[PDB]
């Protein structure tokens, strides 16, 4: 029944694959040229019909697996496209030699075959998304099809140095050759097909490792999480290879040409969204700091020295003699009871003895983490879930090419693209799905931040290229998106809106720094954006941040920092009217036990953060402790333990400004804590427990008076 039907399907698709065509070995010329079969176009049409009538309408993916099994793509479609592109190039060269010279027959048929091949390529390379309603067959074939997609991408980027990209560019230029008014809907569909092909090629990436949870994990445990096919390495599918291929095949020039003449010589409705998606997939995994840094040897020496210092600090925990030397220690508690520890370090040191006592303990309190698979929502891997510090290692030439492409785009058409996208989306807000919201917000944030960084580095290129972010249409769109995401409890869109808002606040701060008189119109924007509801929302974000992932926390922290920065600067500069803004009221709004908790939680992970995150956290702490005089908040034990960890020799490198901040804060905190303890012995007990909420005594606790 089902198995027999699967066998028939596989046999029929295998016959189709063998009937499409193959290399002609009769000719003595080597390497042999690909030869089209008698019914090549009919075979491609039949394959498309199979795709339509089996893969989609019956909600299965057996056709794609059958196609991948018999290598229909890597052996038939790509060679056909490459050969057609080479024929067109030869024809162009002949025309250059003599315009009347022609070496083409059945040109219409060849173009038809090429177009059908490109359509089938887009069909096979379309992103795969698994939902809750997906059938059992669709769920079961996810990983294998993702691996086949990885193979497809590797072949596309490698074969003939990626000439199928040039074939697609030629197909698009065929449509570009006719005027906008003369452009039929078919031509616009072809353009959208080419753009979708490029987006799919960039998007593909390794999938997730899905494991059944029915049974508690065995005593063996997890071996490894590998989704790569047998003969595919991360070097083949990395963005580095994509950049190399695009530069070699002049894809960047075609995209720049499309995005520079956007909304002027083209129909924007077809092209705006594909360009936005292409650029988001381009710049989703790229950190902008890396783009503005032999030097490799110098960095290697510095890293080796860092590891040497870490090893030196580790050495104090190792015994000079072998393990079986057998030294036994007895340590006396304040009461006359002796505890036993083993190890030379125990005898020679006391802190080591207590650390070993702690470490030796078997019982662990359960830690429950709320993990959400990104594949569940259909989103791709991006900055939201990528671990902080994950760096895309570009080569020098590839990095230069990517920077040049981004700079040209930002100086050519970022303004127009943002305007068109914002208009189209605000016209059709409700139809938005989570993917489109995240995509728009992340693209906006990334490009704004990159322009800010380049403006800082280079005095020429300036904010006027990204000035369209300031305009109120985009601002209100972003605000509505973030607020709705908050209200509906959609945390991923919340995160994206958070990032976008942080970038917008940094931008507005820079514009105000530029010129005040020209920034009166931006004082208007500042007044609009700091609306009481918005204030409330922004304040609430941190309080909830503690529940979610690390990245959530970091975005919360950064947005808080930006909000306080703008609030203080604009209160000092002039008066603010939303309802007048009382900076102290907001500040106070920011002072509660959840916020602090959040901060603490974020700081616990200090071995992965940079110095900027620590600087922001301790700036907040300074605001709390000194400016606000809300010291009772910080008289906790989580902070004390974490600060011991930070200041310990094994925790943080001595030669670091972060350690300077930590040491200064620790000095001040210890001084004030000593004063409080001298005043009220009760605080010794108090330290252990959350604040009291008692009318009688609450004040006393909080402020000591």
């Amino acid at each position: 029944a089902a198995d027999f039907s699967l066998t028939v399907l596989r046999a029929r698709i295998a016959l189709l694959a063998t009937a499409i065509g193959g290399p002609d070995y009769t000719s003595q010329i080597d390497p042999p040229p690909y030869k089209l079969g008698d019914d090549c176009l009919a075979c491609l049409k039949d394959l498309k019909r199979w795709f339509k009538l089996v893969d989609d309408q019956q909600k299965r993916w057996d056709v794609a697996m059958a196609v991948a099994e018999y290598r229909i793509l890597t052996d038939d479609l790509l060679p056909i496209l490459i050969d057609w592109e080479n024929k067109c190039s030869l024809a162009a060269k002949l025309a250059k030699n003599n315009p009347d010279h022609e070496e083409f027959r059945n040109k219409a048929y060849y173009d038809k075959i090429a177009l059908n091949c490109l359509q089938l390529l887009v069909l096979m390379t379309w992103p795969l998304i698994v939902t809750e309603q997906s059938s059992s067959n669709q769920i079961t074939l996810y990983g294998e099809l993702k691996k086949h997609q990885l193979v497809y991408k590797k072949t596309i980027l490698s074969m003939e140095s990626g000439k199928v990209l040039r074939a697609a560019i030629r197909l698009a230029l065929d449509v570009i050759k006719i005027d906008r008014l003369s452009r039929t809907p078919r031509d616009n569909m072809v353009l959208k097909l080419v753009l979708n092909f490029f987006r799919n090629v960039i998007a593909i990436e390794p999938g997730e490792f899905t494991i059944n949870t029915k049974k508690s994990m065995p005593k063996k445990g997890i071996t490894s999480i590998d989704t790569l096919p047998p003969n595919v390495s991360m070097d083949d599918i990395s963005l580095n290879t994509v950049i190399s291929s695009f530069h070699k095949n002049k894809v960047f020039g075609f995209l720049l040409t499309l995005t520079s003449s956007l909304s002027k010589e083209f129909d924007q409705d077809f092209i705006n969204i594909p360009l936005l998606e292409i650029m988001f997939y381009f710049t989703k995994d790229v950190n902008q700091e890396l783009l503005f840094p032999t030097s490799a040897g110098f960095e290697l020496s510095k890293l080796l020295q860092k590891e040497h210092q870490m090893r030196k600090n580790v050495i104090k925990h190792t015994s000079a003699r072998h393990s079986r030397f057998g030294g036994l220690l007895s340590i006396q508690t304040p009461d006359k009871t002796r505890l036993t520890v083993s190890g030379s370090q125990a005898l020679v040191d006391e802190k080591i003895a207590l650390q070993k006592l702690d470490d030796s303990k078997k019982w662990n309190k359960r830690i429950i983490k709320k993990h959400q698979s990104v594949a569940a929502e259909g989103l791709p891997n991006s900055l939201l879930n990528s671990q902080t510090g994950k760096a895309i290692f570009f080569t020098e030439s590839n990095g230069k090419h990517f920077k040049e492409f981004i700079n040209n785009f930002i100086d050519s058409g970022f303004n127009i693209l943002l305007h068109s996208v914002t208009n189209y989306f605000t016209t059709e807000q409700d139809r938005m799905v989570t993917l489109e919201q995240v995509e728009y917000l992340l693209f906006f944030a990334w490009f704004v931040k990159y322009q800010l960084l380049r403006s800082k580095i280079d005095n020429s290129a300036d904010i006027k290229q990204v000035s369209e972010a300031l305009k109120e249409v985009t601002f209100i769109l972003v605000s509505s998106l973030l607020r709705s995401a908050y209200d509906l409890k959609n945390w991923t869109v919340t995160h994206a809106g958070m990032i976008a808002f942080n970038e917008l606040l940094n931008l507005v701060s820079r514009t105000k720094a530029a010129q005040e008189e020209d920034s009166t119109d931006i004082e208007f924007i500042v007044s609009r954006l700091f609306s009481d509801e918005r204030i409330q929302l922004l304040s609430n974000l941190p309080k909830i941040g503690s529940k979610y992932s690390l990245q959530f926390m970091k975005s919360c922290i950064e947005l808080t920092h930006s909000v306080l920065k703008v609030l203080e600067q604009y209160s000092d500069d002039k008066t603010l009217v939303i309802i007048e803004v009382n900076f102290q009221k907001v500040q106070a709004n920011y002072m509660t036990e959840p916020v602090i908790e959040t901060y603490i939680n974020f700081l616990e992970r200090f071995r992965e953060l940079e110095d900027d995150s620590i600087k922001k956290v301790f700036s907040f702490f300074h605001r709390v402790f000194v400016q606000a005089k809300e010291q009772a908040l910080l008289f906790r034990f989580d902070l004390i333990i974490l600060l011991r960890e930070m200041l310990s020799p094994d925790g943080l490198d001595r030669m670091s400004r972060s350690r300077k901040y930590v040491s200064q804060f620790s000095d001040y905190f210890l001084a004030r804590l000593k004063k409080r303890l001298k005043k009220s012995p009760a605080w010794f007990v108090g330290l252990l427990f959350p604040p009291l909420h008692n009318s009688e005594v609450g004040f006393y606790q909080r402020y000591g008076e």
């Binding site: 994990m217 005593k219 063996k220 445990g221 997890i222 071996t223 490894s224 999480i225 040497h308 090893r311 030196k312 580790v314 050495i315 925990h317 190792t318 015994s319 000079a320 003699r321 072998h322 393990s323 079986r324 030397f325 057998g326 030294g327 036994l328 220690l329 083993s342 190890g343 030379s344 005898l347 020679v348 470490d359 662990n364 830690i367 983490k369 671990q387 992932s549 690390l550 616990e604 992970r605």
Partner: protein, 233 residues
Amino acid sequence: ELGTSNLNLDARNLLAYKQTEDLYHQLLNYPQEVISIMDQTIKDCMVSLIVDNNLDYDLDEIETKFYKVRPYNVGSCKGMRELNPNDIDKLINLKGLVLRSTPVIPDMKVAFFKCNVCDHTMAVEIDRGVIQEPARCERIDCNEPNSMSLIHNRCSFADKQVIKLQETPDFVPDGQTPHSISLCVYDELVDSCRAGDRIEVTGTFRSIPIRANSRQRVLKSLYKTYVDVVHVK
């Protein structure tokens, strides 16, 4: 000046000083803890010399070294036939002839573990030859339980060697087959004496249980004796 670390100490010098007669007796009675204390103190004085003399010598090099002490001349040398259980875990002197020495044996010091899920590495020390493998990943973000793998070639090892010693001819009372004792040497003392060489060894008389079989924690009643050498002459 020479960059070496091992220090040779004459136990009689402790008796030559009023303060350290108790220390000498303790070393004779409790050698392991006293030796560890002596090593740490030697390192402390070595660093303090540079600290006080504000010399130009690099301190980081000193901080990363391991220092040891090699006491000798701890009393009259006993015989392999006069070692009773009362001498267990005590410092002894023994003269004999070397008969054989096994090749260098790698002895584990620090264990290196790797997470199978996040590529996170951590080093855990070894106590009494017991590897303290984590129950779960130490990373907050990655709390994956029971996913730690031991990378054998990235761990820290030490040098060990077993030597067989025979009593000197004069120690045989009547002319029977001379008895033999097993010696263990670590680090610099390895390859410090070849076969057929007459040597004097200072070490700790130790006893170790022997497992009945390889499957089980079951132990033999009878214990095996050997010497943990600390100085070879």
